Amino acid sequence: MRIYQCHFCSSPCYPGHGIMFVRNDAKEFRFCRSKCHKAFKQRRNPRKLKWTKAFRKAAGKELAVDSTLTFAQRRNVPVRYNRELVATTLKAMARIEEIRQKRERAFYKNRMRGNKEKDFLRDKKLVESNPELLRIRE
Amino acid sequence: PESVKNLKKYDPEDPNRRKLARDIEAENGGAGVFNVNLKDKYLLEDDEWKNDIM
Amino acid sequence: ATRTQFENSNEIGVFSKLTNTYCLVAVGGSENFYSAFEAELGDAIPIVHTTIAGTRIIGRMTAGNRRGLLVPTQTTDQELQHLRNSLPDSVKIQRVEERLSALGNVICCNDYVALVHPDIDRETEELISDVLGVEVFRQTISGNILVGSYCSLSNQGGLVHPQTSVQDQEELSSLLQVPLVAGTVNRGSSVVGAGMVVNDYLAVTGLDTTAPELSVIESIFRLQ
Amino acid sequence: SGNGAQGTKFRISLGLPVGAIMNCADNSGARNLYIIAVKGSGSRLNRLPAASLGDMVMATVKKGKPELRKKVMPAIVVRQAKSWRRRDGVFLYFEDNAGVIANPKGEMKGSAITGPVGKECADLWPRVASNSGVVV
Amino acid sequence: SHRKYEAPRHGHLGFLPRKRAASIRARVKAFPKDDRSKPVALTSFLGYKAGMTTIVRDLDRPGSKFHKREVVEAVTVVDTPPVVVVGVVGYVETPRGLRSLTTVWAEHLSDEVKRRFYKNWYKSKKKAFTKYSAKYAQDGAGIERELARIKKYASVVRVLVHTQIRKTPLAQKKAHLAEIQLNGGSISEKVDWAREHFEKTVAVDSVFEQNEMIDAIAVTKGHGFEGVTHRWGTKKLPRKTHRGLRKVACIGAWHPAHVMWSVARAGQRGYHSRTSINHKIYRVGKGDDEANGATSFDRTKKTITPMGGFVHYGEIKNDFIMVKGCIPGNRKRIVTLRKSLYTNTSRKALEEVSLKWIDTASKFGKGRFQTPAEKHAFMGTLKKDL
RNA sequence: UGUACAACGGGGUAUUGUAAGCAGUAGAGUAGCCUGUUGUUACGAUCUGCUGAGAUUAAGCCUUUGUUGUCUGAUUUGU
RNA sequence: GAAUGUUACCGCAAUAGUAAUUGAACUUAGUACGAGAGGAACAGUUCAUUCGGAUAAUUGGUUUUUGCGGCUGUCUGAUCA
RNA sequence: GCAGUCAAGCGACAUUGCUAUGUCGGCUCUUCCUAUCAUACCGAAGCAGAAUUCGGUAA
RNA sequence: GUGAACAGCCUCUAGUUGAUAGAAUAAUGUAGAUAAGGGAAGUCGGCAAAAUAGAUCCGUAACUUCGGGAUAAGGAUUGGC
């Protein structure tokens, strides 16, 4: 078994889902669902589509580089399948997932910080410019 | 390898020879129903977990 | 020299790979093919029931020597794990992300020298050189692009397809630093590389191989 | 299954019916193939014989070296270009449907094959795999 | 006139007439051989279809080219909550076929089966078993007489069982009564075992098990009045034929002067009871065990139920049986599971099905995640979170 | 007259694709005042941040610790 | 669908129809046979051709969900809608 | 067929040379017959194997 | 208004709401569409459908009664500011 990352969205592609394309260049492209496959068939650029992870990574909407992401790699060199190592990896994956979620939440908070001041300023502008409405209200 | 040189040539016909699991296949169902276990053949530091599932 | 057969295919090289320290065979069919190697190899070197990308052509999808083994991208993690478990630490296993997955046909190599398809990028060439620890050169046998299918090599000698010219034979012999002979296998088959598997002390070919072919194989490979 | 097949054939979608044009994938000099019939297909009323990846078909070369034209020889499909069910659990399809010409014994006319070669064709045909520099 | 061409007839003639089934419950026709050398056990079970899903199984089929490979395939999920015995039937052989001797009911019955005996239940006084309950007690004799009569003359014993509909997500609230023949020990042992189970519940793992082969019997999907083209697969006329083109043009010859019954006229399609055999059970589930959809090759503590629930069906929440292939009938439909009915010894039956991974992605669309945790990890925090 | 039913509402799962409005030392370039040589103030398709935002969600999707409403309308049946 | 004392549930089956079909692949075995060429049985096992019954798990196809976005002419004073 | 040939019976079998003047056809459909092309089961054939010929029931 | 156009569509002045209708969307039809791979293999026969369609620029063969073929054929562009 192997979950594949969508070429157009990087989303996990579980077995028996989506469509795969093989070109004369002797490489394979996997699409999670028909939407991504149709978008690719139109020669669209994922970096210019807002609903694909490529744009978010390029646009900086989410943490693009982090230390946690270094754990996940294509292990071209296998391991001898030690029983203790299996349990250690099982615990480490959960710990890394929790840490990555915390870091992503922190990054989102840092990106969204300051919206409160803008909202307060907009409310002040709306209140100041509508005296008659307030007078009629009370 | 020195092991190959030390190894004795397979006996064409002798009950006292290597099993040649083809014989194992024949003696427990034959070629059509025998189920070869890919495990138990590889080497591990502890054979106790040799049958464990990853 | 020993005669054997796959289920019914005389192209032993397609369904099996043989080296000086390990052997690989297809899992499909029955154990008759597996037992044939045991008669000659016994338990001196490992014999692994392994598949590559779900195919039985593992003999042509993978290439390597006593120092390392290479597999294409299509190989699943399960196959890589099984190969790692079933082989000693002295035999390296390295996944290859090359465009041409036909490692067995693209790469023809022995314990000292190797030949690769010129289209292979220099990165994969360096990876092959480091993992296998052999000299790697870009060459073709008289225009035969697939060196791994039209040539067989070993520390004792090598054999190429009959169409190889005298100049090409001399050049390849000089490059590989081993004797070479142009001839057929499996009763006139020109695909020598895929027809049979050979090592420094054991050559296995299909039943169709004629007596002159077996004698030539034994003489060139110095098996007797 | 015809001669040269070393195993059972998987059930896959029919891509090339009779008269379908498939590009060549060998150095034999041919460029396109015209399918006239499919070997091993059980003809039924109104049902045009159709091939698939790894199938052996009889075709006549339409473009390429004239020496190969007007003669019918067995051909093996290497690319289907129609989605088929792979047991690994992926609905994969090739960019262009293509085939190769070979004798009934399975020996490839061309010394080498160009471009990707389907797994279900290389596995079933040892000669195709040996003469193919790319699989999948 | 030999018409110059031979073609197979469209549609099997054995599945006629193609009329609607008389009941949504597909009554079982034949039970297994009923060899009395084995312990008493049930022969069938009642379940409700709960959609389907995909399975990846490490095929160990020897000889096949998929040996030791990984193959993805479809599996159907049927909601099979425990079943409760509510009576027994004693059958006596007669020259005119099997005949029902007498029926004995339990001491008390749940409202689910009492509801099955009324069509205006909300208006009903609910007098289901007012006198029968009174007859059961105060002597312990009237029922015992019926039990003795059954023991004396009965030949095959059938247990009256009904599904716990209230446990299922269905809003039906009505149970389905069914007769299940008792196999195993002698008829006296059969009735003794059934008697001890009055008002009790029977699980599903005691009847079926992993790797077991079962036969599916249920009413197929209804489609109403259908044209012959889809009803029997008749080929369409070329184009714009007079008086229609989607119908069989020639119906018969002058001699005979009547329309042959086999000329495949148009009519009702679907809703016909069908029987399928050789269905291998892939997994037996329990509602009290967490991680029902987990596997030794997955480790994920997730239920088989897809994200957001099934389509047109609720959450399993009970015991369920996983079977490969497709089962007749649509979702949330009552389907009866029956044994193979014969001593199957094919290697497929002997095969051991150890699931590698179970698909629990949402069936409501192009699902990309197996559990909400994966979706949260991928998408991350959203605006609504803060 | 209660794990009772129905209309909404809250969530889960999906579809699409970044809504109105605001601000910008982004914005090819063209104009008033002035006096540069990042002048400033105007027009400016687009782009940037709020904003994977906005909208729909069963008419044959799952759930409902909430709000509101409903629960004696006619006929027939006898060994 | 009336009449079967009424309704409801669970059952038997007189009777009518009836279906599966065919070739390949491993082992048998390059074994019996055979001077050579070549070359099989049976049993066991694995697929496929045609036909028949189901069903949307996955993928293909349909868009009136007019569900969500964009585009042109025109209209609501402009934006929005 | 022509012209002979001998002969059990009242002429059988064997035997001698050569030797289109009409409109029906095709797509779908159901059924029936065997005088069996293929499939099941068997016998005789120079069936050593392989392949093949005929014959018997079987739609 | 758009547009070369009284081609096609919307709007103002002016004139109409007249074609029996309520509920459902069974088969089959009438009118109009979409479709994975092949691209005529279907059919008596490319029957029907489809495909190019306006404008700007390059280029345009055989024949010819030199007037035509010709928009031959085949190619590049089309929005907004």
Swiss-Prot record, chain A:
Q: Which UniProt keywords apply?
A: Cytoplasm, Nucleus, Phosphoprotein, Ribosome biogenesis
Predominant subcellular localization, coarse grouping: cytoplasm
In Gene Ontology terms, what is one molecular function of this protein? structural constituent of ribosome
Q: Name one GO biological process term.
A: ribosomal large subunit biogenesis
Function per UniProt: Involved in the biogenesis of the 60S ribosomal subunit. Ensures the docking of NOG1 to pre-60S ribosomal particles. Activates and recruits ATPase AFG2 to cytoplasmic pre-60S ribosomal particles.
Quaternary structure note: Associated with nucleolar and cytoplasmic pre-60S particles. At the end of biogenesis it dissociates from cytoplasmic pre-60S particles and is likely to be exchanged for its ribosomal homolog, RPL24. Interacts (via C-terminus) with AFG2 (hexameric form); the interaction is direct, recruits AFG2 to pre-60S ribosomal particles and promotes AFG2 ATPase activity and RLP24 release from pre-60S ribosomal particles. Interacts with NOG1; the interaction is direct.
What's this protein's name?
Answer: Ribosome biogenesis protein RLP24
The top of its lineage is:
Eukaryota, Fungi, Dikarya, Ascomycota, Saccharomycotina
Curated annotation (Swiss-Prot), chain B:
Source taxon at top rank: Eukaryota
- Which compartments does it reside in? Nucleus, Nucleolus
Q: List the disulfide bonds.
A: none
Q: How does it assemble?
A: Associated with nucleolar and cytoplasmic pre-60S particles. Directly interacts with RLP24.
Q: What does this protein do?
A: Involved in the biogenesis of the 60S ribosomal subunit.
Something else known: Present with 28000 molecules/cell in log phase SD medium.
The record's comment on protein family reads: Belongs to the TRAFAC class OBG-HflX-like GTPase superfamily. OBG GTPase family. NOG subfamily.
The protein's name is: Nucleolar GTP-binding protein 1
What species is this protein from?
Saccharomyces cerevisiae (strain ATCC 204508 / S288c) (Baker's yeast)
Part of the full-length chain shown: 379 to 432 of 647
From Swiss-Prot, chain C:
Gene name of the encoded protein: TIF6
Entry PTM:
Phosphorylation at Ser-173 and Ser-174 promotes nuclear export.
Question: What is the similarity comment for this entry?
Answer: Belongs to the eIF-6 family.
Q: What is the predominant subcellular site recorded for this chain?
A: cytoplasm
Tell me, how does this one assemble?
Monomer. Associates with the 60S ribosomal subunit.
- Native source species: Saccharomyces cerevisiae (strain ATCC 204508 / S288c) (Baker's yeast)
**UniProt GO cellular component terms:** cytoplasm; cytosol; nucleolus; nucleus; preribosome, large subunit precursor
List locations, semicolon-separated.
Cytoplasm; Nucleus, Nucleolus
Mark the transmembrane ranges.
none
Q: Does the keyword Phosphoprotein apply?
A: yes
- Where, per the database record, does this protein carry Phosphoserine? 173-174
PANTHER family documented for this protein:
TRANSLATION INITIATION FACTOR 6
Its UniProt miscellaneous note says: Present with 18600 molecules/cell in log phase SD medium.
Entry keyword annotation includes ATP-binding: no
> What keywords is this UniProt entry annotated with?
Cytoplasm, Initiation factor, Nucleus, Phosphoprotein, Protein biosynthesis, Ribosome biogenesis
What the protein does?
Binds to the 60S ribosomal subunit and prevents its association with the 40S ribosomal subunit to form the 80S initiation complex in the cytoplasm. Is also involved in ribosome biogenesis. Associates with pre-60S subunits in the nucleus and is involved in its nuclear export. Cytoplasmic release of TIF6 from 60S subunits and nuclear relocalization is promoted by the GTPase RIA1/EFL1 and by SDO1. Also required for pre-rRNA processing.
- What GO terms are given for molecular function? ribosomal large subunit binding; translation initiation factor activity
Q: What is this protein called?
A: Eukaryotic translation initiation factor 6
From Swiss-Prot, chain D:
Q: Does the keyword Ribosomal protein apply?
A: yes
| One biological process term in Gene Ontology | cytoplasmic translation
SMART domains attached to this UniProt entry:
Ribosomal_L14 (SM01374)
Where is the protein localized? Cytoplasm
- N-acetylserine modified-residue sites: 1
S-S pairs: none
The family line of this record is: Belongs to the universal ribosomal protein uL14 family.
Annotated protein name in UniProt: Large ribosomal subunit protein uL14A
What is the protein's species of origin? Saccharomyces cerevisiae (strain ATCC 204508 / S288c) (Baker's yeast)
Q: Which gene encodes it?
A: RPL23A
